[PDB]
Amino acid sequence: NFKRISYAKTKTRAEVRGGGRKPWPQKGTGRARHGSIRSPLWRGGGVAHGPRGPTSYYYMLPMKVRALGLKVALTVKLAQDDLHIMDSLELPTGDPQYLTELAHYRRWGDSVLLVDLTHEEMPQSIVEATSRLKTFNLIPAVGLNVHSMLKHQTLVLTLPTVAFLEDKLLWQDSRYRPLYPFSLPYSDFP
Amino acid sequence: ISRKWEKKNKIVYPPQLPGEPRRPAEIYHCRRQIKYSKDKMWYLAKLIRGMSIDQALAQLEFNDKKGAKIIKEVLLEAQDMAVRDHNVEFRSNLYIAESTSGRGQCLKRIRYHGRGRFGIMEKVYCHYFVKLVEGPPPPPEPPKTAVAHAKEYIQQLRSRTIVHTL
């Protein structure tokens, strides 16, 4: 929801073209009194309470909550035997057929999310294999998130990746309240 | 719009077994978009409802209404096509089974009134529908006799039960 921008907008009675003048006198005719042809009651009128403009749905959960989310997801993956650890995401061949049949044999599931430590130093074999595939998805460690983990049945982590995750997530516990954003230099942080 | 009445003549029944009564021929025919009120047309349709073809044609011939000649034309067309296409033996051996008027598509016009004010005039159109059935016209239902009434009343008395009891 945080990224969501709704682009739905409707014209208010003001915004609808015309409708300046009073359609008929108030008292003279046997008709109901109206003062514009563009009121919500009229056909082709403005809407009373419709969507207004681009609307933003942006909000931030506390940083600690979001980190706890990640920890919880990893815990649940391990508990339900859906987490697998790899020394490296190295394949003998770049054939996606190989990867699918491997996963079928290992009884992983329909969908596998593979996580490498870094994007640049990703092996070419796994990149080639995963690019073609739809259910198999390759992300760097920085790209890990709760939605992806829940969407995919099987989570595959590298040993570099697991060490990396532990460091980053455990840092959230046993940290001070920030004086200023962590992007700015600290003594011990980067 | 719907035009189901036309499609009714397109029905084909399977061949009859030798040990079966002969099926009377049915003919469906209509005139669409008659410039005439359906309400006015109704009276003429009602008039010829039970009648034979010749009786109906006679009555229509000597009627003063505009719609009478239109129904006469439709009846004649139906009689012709009955003999030609639907394998009716005799043109006389037909009677009106169904005779109906329906509303047509209509046009709105303006009727000017004697101030700035006005009215909306509607140009009426109607459909006339007819179904002809081969055979003599069925005899009219006889008026209820005193004996029939008596019998019905006795039946009512005999039918009655002790109510709200064991």
Binding site: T29 | L107, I110, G116, R117, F118, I120
Partner: peptide
């Protein structure tokens, strides 16, 4: 004192069968 009559748009009564 007096209210003027209102006329309907002409197109409404000028409609014809589509052929």
């Amino acid at each position: 004192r007096f209210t003027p009559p209102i006329y309907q748009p002409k197109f409404k009564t000028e409609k014809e069968f589509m052929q």
